[PDB]
Design a protein around this nucleic acid. Structure first.
Length: 580
DNA sequence: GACCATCCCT
DNA sequence: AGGAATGGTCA
């Protein structure tokens, strides 16, 4: 039943071949400064299981890990590389990462281990990690005999599956996408994560003090105005005070009871003073739980740093996501919350944070793919696009655009981006579909090319079964041909949206790779810290700011060539907050 | 341990 | 259109 492997107690010369499938196993979910539990190598000479202590103490092994000339096939190499970075070891030569290769072929399958990736091509000579390691309170590294076998099986799997995966990719015209975009990007992310971002804790802790006092005030009020105490954070308990005791109008039901979202409470404010106090409490509460307490809990005390993990093979569109902490949802919209960014600071002395963002990248991508003339023009003029849209759909001159007319031409614009229907717009603008379709009809009259795109795209999705991005990312939409209207329409929104959202991910991903090449060429010390969807955040010495101001937007703006110009803006300052 | 509902970002 | 983290809940 077993798979044959030498359980090596010493590193021999035949374990160091030029081509190999390697496994450096890090069971911990958060791999930052995480133990490596075992190692397996498979190559032309055999199958080997090496204990970390033995192997990682071996100058010959660690030299093989670092040699770029020695090519290694792997599953989720970033996990491996970071875990080794924390131990002063560099991993190079990884020319094939199956996790990223599975992800490119079909992001829907949710590949998250070798077993899942293996089934894709009908190979099942390997177990689901969860099967070996357990789950949750049961998670545990097993004994050496079981471990070594599993690890060798994974390795064997990778060795087996490379050629078939790489062949399919090529058919799909995604071979370069793997080797030139996603894999090279894997390295940059490794470094970004390892580096981390410094957190001024005292600053954070003080904010935690002020909030604690402010929440204590609002809380008391709420109970006073309620004439009672209850768990304000309970959707069920609160829904009893609002909709039963104070007889507030039920404007919405959730699946399990009445809805107490901000949207509902905003409308109920005129009826009772308790409402404003609840929303105020929720705002200050979110900040306390997620942005002061949640953060201080993941700051490493040793370096006062946070090292996020960037998931590269998770999002359905090609975007990244970051975890523990999520450094892509730090509050910026309201001033109270925006001040949480004062706690993100440069890691050295005399350094500054530097933020470069893309200006309306999505809509610029739409302009390019749809080839809409009116829209291409608007961008060649570097116009305010919301004002411009307000001018066209409402048939007025620049000076006639009122603030609300602009607020709505915005709502629509993102409607178009998301492929939204009258109904989605209706609620979004607070109105009715009878009038929401009038805007839409009116939009497509000023933008015949975008209309033309929505039609062609849904149809190609219908015919081909998938939609593609500029750089060849792919999304299968099996639900497009569904008979259920809800399920059909949603797939159509995806057909419409994914090439836009996903071509934007590709572009910034390419930027990131170009930025790295240049930072190195220019011998600048500036290092890339975060990526927030259309934004790159760096920290550099104060001396380098001036060059970065000219260098970063140019590398970004030049990442690809669309029919409309790309436009970047930048800022910098003592803290992240100030990079505004 | 999963779900839910709520809220934060692009 | 894509994501992630929390407290409550009932299990």
């Amino acid at each position: 039943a077993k798979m044959a492997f030498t359980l090596a107690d010493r590193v021999t010369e035949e374990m160091l071949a030029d081509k190999a499938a390697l496994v450096v196993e890090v069971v911990e979910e958060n791999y930052h400064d995480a133990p490596i539990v075992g190692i397996a190598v498979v190559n032309e000479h055999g199958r080997f299981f090496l204990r970390p202590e033995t192997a990682l103490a071996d100058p010959q092994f660690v030299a093989w890990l670092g040699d770029e000339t020695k090519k290694k096939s792997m599953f989720d190499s970033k996990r491996a590389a970071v875990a080794l970075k924390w131990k002063g070891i560099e991993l190079c030569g990884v020319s094939f990462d199956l996790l990223l290769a599975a992800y490119l072929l079909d992001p829907a399958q949710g590949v998250d281990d070798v077993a899942a990736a293996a089934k894709m091509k009908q190979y099942e000579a390997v177990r689901p990690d969860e099967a070996v390691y357990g789950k949750g309170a049961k998670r545990a590294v097993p004994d050496e005999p079981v471990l070594a076998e599993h690890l060798v099986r994974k390795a064997a799997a990778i060795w087996a599956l490379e050629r078939p995966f790489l062949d399919e990719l090529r058919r799909n015209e995604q071979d370069r996408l793997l080797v030139e975009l996603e894999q090279p990007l894997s390295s940059i992310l490794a470094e970004m994560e390892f580096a981390g971002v410094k957190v001024d804790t005292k600053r954070l802790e003080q904010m935690g003090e002020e909030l604690a006092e402010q929440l204590r005030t609002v809380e008391q009020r709420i109970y006073e105005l309620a004439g009672q105490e209850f768990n304000i954070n309970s959707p069920k308990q609160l829904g009893v005070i609002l909709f039963e005791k104070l007889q507030l109008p039920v404007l919405k039901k959730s699946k399990t009871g009445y809805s107490t979202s901000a949207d509902v409470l905003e409308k109920l404010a005129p009826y009772h003073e308790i409402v404003e106090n609840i929303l105020h409490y929720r705002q200050l509460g979110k900040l306390q739980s997620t942005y002061i307490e949640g953060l201080l809990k993941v700051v490493r005390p040793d370096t006062k740093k946070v090292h996020t993990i960037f998931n590269q093979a998770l999002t359905q569109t090609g975007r990244l996501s970051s975890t523990e902490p999520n450094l892509q949802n730090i509050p910026i919209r309201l001033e109270e919350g925006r001040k949480i960014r004062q706690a993100f600071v440069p890691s050295e002395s005399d350094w500054l944070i530097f933020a470069a963002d893309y200006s309306q990248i999505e809509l610029r991508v739409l302009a390019h793919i749809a080839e809409d003339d009116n829209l291409m023009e608007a961008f060649r003029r570097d116009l305010d696009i919301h004002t411009k849209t307000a001018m066209d759909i409402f048939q007025v001159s620049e000076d006639e655009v009122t603030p609300n007319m602009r607020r709505q031409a915005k709502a629509v614009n993102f409607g178009i981006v998301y492929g939204i229907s009258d109904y989605g717009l209706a609620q979004n603008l607070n109105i009715s579909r009878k009038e929401a379709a009038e805007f839409i009809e009116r939009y497509f009259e000023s933008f015949p090319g975008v209309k033309r795109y929505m039609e062609n795209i849904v149809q190609e999705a219908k015919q081909k079964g998938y939609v593609t991005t500029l750089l060849h990312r792919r999304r299968y939409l099996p639900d497009i041909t569904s008979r259920n209207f809800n399920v059909r329409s949603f797939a159509e929104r995806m057909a419409m949206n994914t090439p836009i959202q996903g071509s934007a991910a590709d572009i910034i991903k390419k930027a990131m790779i170009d930025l790295n090449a240049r930072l190195k060429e220019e011998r600048l010390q500036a290092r890339l810290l975060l990526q927030v969807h259309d934004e790159l955040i760096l920290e550099a010495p104060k001396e380098e700011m001036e060059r970065l101001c000219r260098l970063v937007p140019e590398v970004m703006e030049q990442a690809v060539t669309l029919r409309v110009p790309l436009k970047v803006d930048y800022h910098y300052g003592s803290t992240w907050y100030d990079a505004k």
